[PDB]
Amino acid sequence: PNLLFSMCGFEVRILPRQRMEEVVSNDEGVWDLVDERTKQRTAKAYLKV
Amino acid sequence: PQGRIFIKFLFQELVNELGLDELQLRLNSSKLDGMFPLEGDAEHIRYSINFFTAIGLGLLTEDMRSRLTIIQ
């Protein structure tokens, strides 16, 4: 389910909201990925250093 | 009108997490009456539908759009 990568010093774990099997409100160190058109949030990007 | 803006930000945030899909289900199951009049008072329904179409969504207003033609 995960898609990992890292750029600069950021490490990013991309979970599509689909396969998370649960959607939980999470802290501010976690991005929400918003589609262009549907204006939805389809994936959470977890950030670490 | 300040409060109007408040509502605007409220639903415009509340959409992005649900995505306008779950929105219609929750609302339709949340029995909001005073905000979504089906009982009558045409002009108020004009204000509601015109308002949500002013937000830029308006897809919550179809059930009320029917009641426009039913009033006329």
Is residue B16 within 8 angstroms of chain A, CB to CB? yes
Residue A38 C-alpha, separation from nearest chain B C-alpha, in angstroms: 7
| Cβ proximity of A43 and A35 under 8 Å | no
* Residues B54, A23: Cα–Cα separation, whole Å: 30
**Method used to solve the structure:** cryo-EM
In terms of DSSP bridges, do strands A30-34 and A3-7 run parallel, antiparallel, or are they unpaired?
unpaired
**CA B46, CA B15: separation in Å to the nearest integer?**
22
> How far, in Å, CA of A37 to CA of A24, rounded?
23
